[PDB]
């Protein structure tokens with residue numbers, strides 16, 4: 001499928017370029033992140049709930065979801081989101097804003113038929129962790 005190949009090529013090229021940039025931390029899983037603003041709060045565990053502000057975009061800059069201008073943050077259980085978020089959240093002190101770069105395998109994978117997120121899409125998120133509930 002043409003889109004699956006295109007998205008894989010673009011994502012791999014992005015991650016390969018981004019890993020060299022100052023402030024980009026590359027984890028063993030392949031998840032990448034960059035600290036935008038450091039917070040001093042607790043880090044959530046895998047069973048915790050979090051309140052967050054966030055924006056998700058594709059490599060070409062297209063925003064596909066955001067809490068911005070909605071008037072409310074979003075709430076998630078740490079383990080009930082995509083793996084890249086589950087992993088990233090557990091490293092984030094409350095109060096922090098990070099940009100995370102999620103390889104498609106830690107997001108929706110290669111059979112993501114279509115919709116907002118098609119196959120082999122590497123996803124980029126700005127995540128402001130507001131609070132953690134144990």
Ligand SMILES: O=C1[C@@H]2CCC[C@H]([C@@H](CO)CN1Cc1ccccn1)N2S(=O)(=O)c1cc(Cl)cc(Cl)c1
Pocket residue numbers: 056064065076080081082085116117123
């Ligand atoms: O795991 C998630 C991730 C990470 C947390 C923020 C959002 C939530 C918004 O509810 C969606 N999920 C879980 C989810 C639930 C149902 C279907 C697909 N993904 N997403 S997302 O990647 O921005 C996203 C947002 C939207 Cl509108 C559609 C999709 Cl398919 C994915």
Ligand code: NA
Pocket residue numbers: 006007010
């Ligand atoms: Na693409």
Ligand code: NA
Pocket residue numbers: 067068069070071072
């Ligand atoms: Na707002």
Ligand code: NA
Pocket residue numbers: 037038039095096097128
């Ligand atoms: Na912050």
